[PDB]
Enzyme design. Structure first.
Site, PDB file in Angstrom:
ATOM      1  N   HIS A  40       1.110 -26.661  50.201  1.00  0.00           N
ATOM      2  CA  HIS A  40       0.795 -25.228  50.378  1.00  0.00           C
ATOM      3  C   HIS A  40       0.712 -24.519  49.029  1.00  0.00           C
ATOM      4  CE1 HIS A  40       5.213 -24.029  50.406  1.00  0.00           C
ATOM      5  NE2 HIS A  40       4.663 -22.879  50.013  1.00  0.00           N
ATOM      6  N   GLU A  52       9.819 -25.724  30.252  1.00  0.00           N
ATOM      7  CA  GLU A  52      10.059 -24.284  30.393  1.00  0.00           C
ATOM      8  C   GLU A  52      11.518 -23.954  30.648  1.00  0.00           C
ATOM      9  OE1 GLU A  52       8.319 -21.874  29.651  1.00  0.00           O
ATOM     10  OE2 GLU A  52       6.217 -21.995  30.285  1.00  0.00           O
ATOM     11  N   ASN A  54      12.551 -19.817  29.916  1.00  0.00           N
ATOM     12  CA  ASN A  54      11.973 -18.495  30.237  1.00  0.00           C
ATOM     13  C   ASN A  54      10.498 -18.670  30.356  1.00  0.00           C
ATOM     14  OD1 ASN A  54      11.006 -15.833  29.978  1.00  0.00           O
ATOM     15  ND2 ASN A  54      13.026 -15.167  29.279  1.00  0.00           N
ATOM     16  N   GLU A  62       7.901 -26.072  25.112  1.00  0.00           N
ATOM     17  CA  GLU A  62       6.908 -26.198  26.212  1.00  0.00           C
ATOM     18  C   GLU A  62       5.806 -27.220  25.884  1.00  0.00           C
ATOM     19  OE1 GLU A  62       7.709 -23.269  24.605  1.00  0.00           O
ATOM     20  OE2 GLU A  62       8.318 -21.806  26.098  1.00  0.00           O
ATOM     21  N   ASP A  84       3.877 -31.500  53.840  1.00  0.00           N
ATOM     22  CA  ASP A  84       3.650 -30.478  52.781  1.00  0.00           C
ATOM     23  C   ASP A  84       3.955 -31.075  51.407  1.00  0.00           C
ATOM     24  OD1 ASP A  84       3.109 -28.159  51.478  1.00  0.00           O
ATOM     25  OD2 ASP A  84       4.972 -27.104  52.136  1.00  0.00           O
ATOM     26  N   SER A 172      16.679 -21.455  48.651  1.00  0.00           N
ATOM     27  CA  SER A 172      15.447 -21.261  47.887  1.00  0.00           C
ATOM     28  C   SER A 172      14.628 -20.157  48.540  1.00  0.00           C
ATOM     29  CB  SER A 172      14.721 -22.551  47.718  1.00  0.00           C
ATOM     30  OG  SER A 172      14.371 -23.130  48.958  1.00  0.00           O
ATOM     31  N   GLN A 174      10.591 -17.554  48.089  1.00  0.00           N
ATOM     32  CA  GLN A 174       9.248 -17.433  47.605  1.00  0.00           C
ATOM     33  C   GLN A 174       9.200 -17.630  46.108  1.00  0.00           C
ATOM     34  OE1 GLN A 174      10.070 -15.616  50.745  1.00  0.00           O
ATOM     35  NE2 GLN A 174       8.433 -16.936  51.420  1.00  0.00           N
ATOM     36  N   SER A 177       8.634 -22.577  45.941  1.00  0.00           N
ATOM     37  CA  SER A 177       7.856 -23.618  46.678  1.00  0.00           C
ATOM     38  C   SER A 177       7.259 -24.649  45.723  1.00  0.00           C
ATOM     39  CB  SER A 177       6.707 -22.949  47.413  1.00  0.00           C
ATOM     40  OG  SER A 177       7.225 -22.201  48.516  1.00  0.00           O
TER      41      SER A 177
HETATM   42 CA   LIG Z   1       8.731 -20.473  27.945  1.00  0.00          CA
END
Ligand SMILES: [Ca+2]
Length: 223
Positions: A40, A52, A54, A62, A84, A172, A174, A177
Site C-alpha cells: 500500500h 537517516e 532526522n 545518509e 501487503d 504504530s 500513519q 507503514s
Molecule cells: Ca537526515
C-alpha cells in the site's frame, strides 16, 4: 509511532525512509540492492533514503538512492490489505556500513508473545497529529491469532498478525507503514494497518513476512 521512544541515531540501520518529495512510508533494507515495504506504500518516483535519523536535516550519514523497480506482491489485495508487501530495487547498491545495514529474513515464523522492535517516522499522536523528525521506536509483543481475530472480526488472514497493547496507548501509525517489525533479529512483520492508532482493543496489524520468504528470494534471484 504513538507511545514510543527516540531510537537513537542509526541504531536501527536497516530502517529506510521512502521519499517522493517528502517522507511517506518506511521500509527495511534486506541486502545492498533491495528494500522490503508495504504494497500500500506503492508510488512511482520513489527515492530510498538510508542512514537517516532526522529526515529534515542532512546529518552526514545518509545515502539517497533512486528506486529502479518496484514489485508489488502478485496477490496483493488493496481492499483487504492481504499480501501487503512490495520489493523495491535500488538503482545502485548501498554502501553497507555501521549505520546502513541489512536485516535478515526469517527462517521460521515468530511466536505469539515475542517482543519485537517497530520503528518509523509516523504520527506520534492517537488523537490528532504530530510528526517527529527523528526516528521513533516501540517494543511490542505479538498477540495470539485468536485475540487478533477477535479485535478485527472477518478481517484477519493467515498473512497477517497483530502486535501491541489492547489497553491502548502504544502502536504504530500513519507514516510508519511499510517499516520493520523485527523479532529475534529477523524481519517478521511490515507495518500494514489498524483502526486508528493506539486505540483500545484495536492493535496494529502487520504483514507476516515469514510467508513471503520464497517469493522474496525467487524475485531477487530474477531481477
Ligand atoms: Ca537526515
Amino acid at each position: 509511532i504513538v507511545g514510543g521512544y527516540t531510537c537513537g541515531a542509526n541504531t536501527v540501520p536497516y530502517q529506510v525512509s521512502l521519499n517522493s518529495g517528502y517522507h511517506f512510508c518506511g521500509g527495511s533494507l534486506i541486502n545492498s540492492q533491495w528494500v522490503v515495504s508495504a504494497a500500500h506504500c506503492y508510488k512511482s518516483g520513489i527515492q530510498v533514503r538510508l542512514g537517516e535519523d532526522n529526515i529534515n536535516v542532512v546529518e552526514g550519514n545518509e545515502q539517497f538512492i533512486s528506486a529502479s523497480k518496484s514489485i508489488v506482491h502478485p496477490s496483493y489485495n488493496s481492499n483487504t490489505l492481504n499480501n501487503d508487501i512490495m520489493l523495491i530495487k535500488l538503482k545502485s547498491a548501498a554502501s553497507l556500513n555501521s549505520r546502513v545495514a541489512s536485516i535478515s529474513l526469517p527462517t521460521s515464523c515468530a511466536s505469539a508473545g515475542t517482543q519485537c522492535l517497530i520503528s518509523g517516522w509516523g504520527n506520534t499522536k492517537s488523537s490528532g497529529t504530530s510528526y517527529p523528525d527523528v526516528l521513533k521506536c516501540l517494543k511490542a509483543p505479538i498477540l495470539s491469532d485468536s485475540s487478533c481475530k477477535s479485535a478485527y472480526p472477518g478481517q484477519i488472514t493467515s498473512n497477517m498478525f497483530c502486535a501491541g497493547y489492547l489497553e491502548g496507548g502504544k502502536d504504530s501509525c500513519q507514516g510508519d507503514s511499510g517499516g520493520p517489525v523485527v523479532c529475534s533479529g529477523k524481519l517478521q512483520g511490515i507495518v500494514s494497518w489498524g483502526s486508528g492508532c493506539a486505540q483500545k482493543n484495536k492493535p496494529g496489524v502487520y504483514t507476516k513476512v515469514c510467508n513471503y520468504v520464497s517469493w522474496i528470494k525467487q524475485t531477487i534471484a530474477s531481477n
